[PDB]
């Protein structure tokens, strides 16, 4: 029987009707069936709950806290396999919805709210170039494809970037770091969340207009470089973002306002380069150490070609 | 620090060593301050500490990472044993311990922690835990979010005079245990300079009157407690059985891996009827 454990958690953690409720009447339905996150719609007929099984205290102290602040589902029980999580009738929102004005703004301000937070995690801005440096080292028909990636001269370019981004001031704030369409229901899943350059969070969100992972045929993803936010679009994100992040912002002069936004367009767009390089690196390492399923070298090539395309567009 | 400078905001990022001074206090406790925070050197306790922190009924939480934590330094002395009997303190601890109980928490609601922990000289035991289980296996006591460690040296008289800290042991448990365990603490002084570091007295244990002025403060801060005076007495009487029998749990379990807490457990065994 599929419900093998399941019943045992829901009876034990959820109070009231779940307290006595016999096994003959435990109704569970699968929602997502993953190798490192299975989802389940356990209920009774808190009437329904979301079971989510399969160094990191981060994305569980995080989840808790957002459940305290009404900005995430409630935490109805936690245990070393997963958690029982409030069910909210909801769905992942697909890549094509991100450009909507309705949804875009919201995300911009929610990401501003997120960056606003002050949290009990390491504040040393290590995550970005510490991870990238580790992966580049690690890296050094597949055998074939890797060469074409490595022929780009990744070690050099990585310091070319270190240079470029070190010239680009970006405030250090608690970033989500994976703010793409499949993590917005409300903004969820903090696997890779940490303190980081705000630039990365945004630019990585922009990069994310290009890639759709809703896929069951290899390579399991689609890339549309002609789908990155336009200038007007970017600005508009930033201008739903700034007033949600700086209380002082709305009363600045237009030269002040305009100067910021001008400077922030440069910021997030140079950081978008980091998103291509980080994830490009990440993907290659997964083409080896992955029990998941995806087209990781293809994804790599996609991320890298963007990266070189990207930096031609910027001209520096 | 590292650790401190790694996690704290402001001047802390700019600090160096030597330029920072900690100060040992008790695994270990520490006391770090600028040229102040508590340094305590897994996931499940972190989730716990933070939620409590978030409900502003704990010290502030600044850092949390695998082998430890960084907390609000809360200017105060800790109470000593003799203060506990004070009608005013005892009452406040009863109102505090009550809310701490009425909190929803994301953990196991089947009391396993109690029996489980005990499982985990000439005193030949386990067959004693067997009565101790069966007996308490009867006693109905509503489950709640228990502190599991209400000693004087865990209650701060800060400079509503007090709040409670140090919840390393804060499981879900039978209400009887928490309340009862606190009562057992009136009997144990963890002062005394000489060996064996403590003094004890079965007479300092709260009387019928004392533990009642206590449990009549706790029920309002829990419970509408408009209910008839006769319904309140039945609630009180009710709870005494539970409180005092579950005080045997207190004694016994407190054979932390010397301290003849047993001598008392056998005592309240005669005194109880069972
Ligand atoms: N609290 C919740 N209540 C109801 N449905 C949820 C909840 N969280 C996630 N889901 C469902 O799961 C999908 C997203 O799952 P997600 O957690 O992003 O995947 P993964 O399990 O691989 O990390 C959405 O389509 C949504 O319907």
Nearest residue of chain B to residue A60 (CA atoms): B47
Name the region of A153 (left: φ>0; alpha: ψ -120 to 50; beta: rest). left
**Distance from the alpha carbon of residue B170 to the mean position of ligand 1, in angstroms:** 31
Contact B61, B49 (CB under 8 A): yes
Distance CA A32, CA B258 (A): 55
Q: Which helix (H) or strand (E) holds B39?
A: strand B37-40
B1-41+61-73 classified as CATH 3.30.200.20: yes
* Tokens representing residue B129 in the block: 């835990």
B25 is in an annotated binding site: no
* Tokens representing residue A30 in the block: 């699968």
A1-55+74-87 classified as CATH 3.30.565.10: no
The residues facing A52 across adjacent strands are: A39, A83
Distance CA A39, CA A50 (A): 7
A34 is in an annotated binding site: yes
- Selection from B179, B151, B161, B158 nearest residue B81 by Cα: B151
Q: Are B9 and A123 inside 8 Å of each other by CB?
A: yes
Residue intervals of chain A classified under CATH 3.90.1200.10 are 56-73+88-316
Report DSSP letters for chain A, one per residue: -TTTTTHHHHHHHS-THHHH--GGG-B--EEE--SS-EEEEEE----EEEEEE----HHHHHHHHHHHTTSS--EEEEEBTEEEEE--S-----GGGTTSHHHHHHHHHHHHHHHH---SS--STTHHHHHHHHHHHHH--HHHHHHHHHTT-HHHHHHHHHHHHHTS---EEEE-S--SGGGB--B---TT-EEEEHHHHHHHHHHTTSEE---SSTT--EE-GGGSPPHHHHHHHHHHHHHHH-GGGGGS-HHHHHHHHHHHHHHHHHHHHHHHHHHHHHHHHHHHH-SS-S-HHHHHHHHHHHHHHHHHHHT-
Residue intervals of chain A classified under CATH 3.30.200.20 are 1-55+74-87
Sheet strand arrangement including A75-79: A30-32, A38-43, A48-53, A82-86, A75-79
The residues facing A196 across adjacent strands are: A173
What are the CA-CA distances from residue B272 to residues B244, B266, B267 (Å)?
8, 10, 8
* Tokens representing residue B254 in the block: 């407190």
Distance CA B156, CA B79 (A): 6
Segments of B47-195 assigned E as strands: 61-65, 68-72, 76-78, 143-145, 155-158, 162-164, 172-174, 188-189
- Assigned CATH topology for domain A56-73+88-316: Aminoglycoside 3'-phosphotransferase; Chain: A, domain 2 (3.90.1200)
Distance CA B119, CA B54 (A): 33
Distance CA A3, CA A40 (A): 10
Nearest residue of chain B to residue A121 (CA atoms): B63
Cβ neighbours around B145 below 10 Å, total: 23
Q: Are B106 and A64 inside 8 Å of each other by CB?
A: yes
B42-60+74-274 classified as CATH 3.90.1200.10: yes
Residue intervals of chain B classified under CATH 3.90.1200.10 are 42-60+74-274
Instruction: Assess A17–B contact: CB distance below 8 Å, yes or no.
Output: no
A20 is in an annotated binding site: no
Report the first-to-last Cα separation within chain B, whole angstroms: 54
Distance CA A32, CA A57 (A): 23
Backbone angles phi, psi at B122, to 5 degrees: -70, -10
Contact A304, A311 (CB under 8 A): no
Residue nearest to atom 2 of ligand 1 (CA): A87
What are the CA-CA distances from residue A97 to residues A31, A111, A180, A309, B210 (Å)?
22, 17, 11, 25, 65
Pocket test for ligand 1, best of A90, A180, A182 (most atoms within 8 A of CB): A90
In this complex, the residue of A68, A118, A122 whose CB is nearest that of residue B54 is A68
Pocket test for ligand 1, best of A32, A87, A176 (most atoms within 8 A of CB): A32
Contact B43, A57 (CB under 8 A): yes
Cβ neighbours around A170 below 10 Å, total: 22
CA dihedral A244, A209, A193, A216 (to 10 degrees): 140
Pocket of ligand 1 (CB under 6 A): A 31-32, 34, 37, 39, 50, 73, 85-88, 90-92, 182, 189
Contact B170, B147 (CB under 8 A): yes
Distance CA A56, CA A121 (A): 11
Residue intervals of chain B classified under CATH 3.30.200.20 are 1-41+61-73
Q: Which residues does chain B have within 8 Å of residue A83's beta carbon, measured at their own beta carbons?
A: 106
- Selection from A282, A296, A297, A302 nearest residue A145 by Cα: A297
Pocket test for ligand 1, best of A50, A95, A176, A185 (most atoms within 8 A of CB): A185
Distance CA A53, CA A37 (A): 6
Residue B250 contacts by C-beta under 8 Å, 6 or more apart in sequence?
B177, B180, B181, B183, B184
Find the helix packing angle between B43-54 and A58-68, rounded to 10°: 30
Distance CA A13, CA B142 (A): 15
Distance CA B114, CA B40 (A): 25
Contact B64, A57 (CB under 8 A): yes
**Distance from the alpha carbon of residue A91 to the mean position of ligand 1, in angstroms:** 7
**Distance from the alpha carbon of residue A174 to the mean position of ligand 1, in angstroms:** 23
- Selection from B62, B15, B70, B66 nearest residue B39 by Cα: B70
Strand bridging mode A82-86 / A48-53: antiparallel
**Distance from the alpha carbon of residue A92 to the mean position of ligand 1, in angstroms:** 7
Contact A257, A125 (CB under 8 A): no
Contact B79, A70 (CB under 8 A): no
Cβ neighbours around A77 below 10 Å, total: 22
Residue nearest to atom 14 of ligand 1 (CA): A92
Residue A137 contacts by C-beta under 8 Å, 6 or more apart in sequence?
none
Q: Which residues does chain B have within 8 Å of residue A60's beta carbon, measured at their own beta carbons?
A: 43, 46-47
- Selection from B93, B89, B94, B102 nearest residue B215 by Cα: B94
Resolution (A): 3.1
Q: Nearest-CA distance from B113 to chain A in Å?
A: 13
Backbone angles phi, psi at A76, to 5 degrees: -100, 55
Distance CA A302, CA A222 (A): 9
Q: Which helix (H) or strand (E) holds B184?
A: helix B175-185
Instruction: Assess A71–B contact: CB distance below 8 Å, yes or no.
Output: no
Q: Are B6 and A124 inside 8 Å of each other by CB?
A: yes
Sheet strand arrangement including B68-72: B29-32, B37-40, B68-72, B61-65
**Technique used to solve these coordinates:** X-ray
Q: Which atom of ligand 1 is nearest to the CA of A52?
A: 21
Instruction: Assess A119–B contact: CB distance below 8 Å, yes or no.
Output: no
* Tokens representing residue B92 in the block: 């406040």
- Biggest distance spanned by C-alpha atoms of chain A: 68
Distance CA B159, CA B244 (A): 33
B223 is in an annotated binding site: no
Distance CA B105, CA A168 (A): 44
Q: Which atom of ligand 1 is nearest to the CA of A191?
A: 23
Contact B206, B174 (CB under 8 A): no
Chain center to CA of A11? 33
């Amino acid at each position: 029987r599929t419900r093998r454990r399941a019943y045992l958690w829901c009876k034990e953690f959820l109070p009231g009707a779940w307290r006595g409720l016999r096994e003959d009447e435990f109704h569970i339905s699968v929602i997502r069936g993953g190798l490192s996150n299975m989802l389940f719609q356990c209920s009774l007929p808190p009437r329904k709950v979301l079971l989510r099984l399969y160094a990191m205290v981060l994305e569980s102290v995080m989840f808790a806290i957002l459940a305290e602040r009404s900005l995430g589902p409630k935490l109805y029980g936690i245990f070393p396999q997963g958690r029982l999580e409030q069910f909210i009738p909801s769905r992942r929102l697909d890549t094509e919805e991100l450009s909507l004005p309705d949804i875009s703004a919201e995300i911009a301000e929610k990401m501003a709210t997120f960056h606003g937070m002050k949290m009990p995690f390491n504040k040393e801005p290590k995550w970005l170039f510490g991870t990238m440096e580790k992966y580049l080292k690690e890296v050094l028909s597949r055998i074939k494809k890797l060469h074409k990636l490595l022929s780009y001269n990744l070690p050099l370019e990585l310091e070319n970037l270190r240079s470029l981004l070190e010239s680009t001031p970006s405030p250090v704030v608690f970033c989500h770091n994976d703010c793409q369409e499949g993590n917005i229901l409300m903004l969820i899943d903090f696997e890779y969340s940490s303190y980081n350059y705000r630039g990365f969070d945004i630019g990585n969100h922009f990069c994310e207009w290009m890639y759709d992972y809703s896929y069951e045929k290899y390579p399991f993803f689609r890339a549309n470089i002609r789908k990155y936010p336009t200038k007007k679009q970017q600005l508009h994100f930033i201008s739903s973002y700034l007033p949600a992040f700086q209380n002082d912002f709305e009363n600045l002069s237009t030269e002040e306002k305009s100067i910021i936004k001008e400077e922030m367009l440069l910021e997030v767009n140079r950081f978008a380069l980091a998103s291509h390089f980080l994830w490009g690196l990440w993907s290659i390492v997964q083409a080896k150490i992955s029990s998941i399923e995806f087209g990781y070298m293809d994804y790599a090539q996609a991320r890298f070609d963007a990266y070189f395309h990207q930096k031609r567009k910027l001209g520096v």
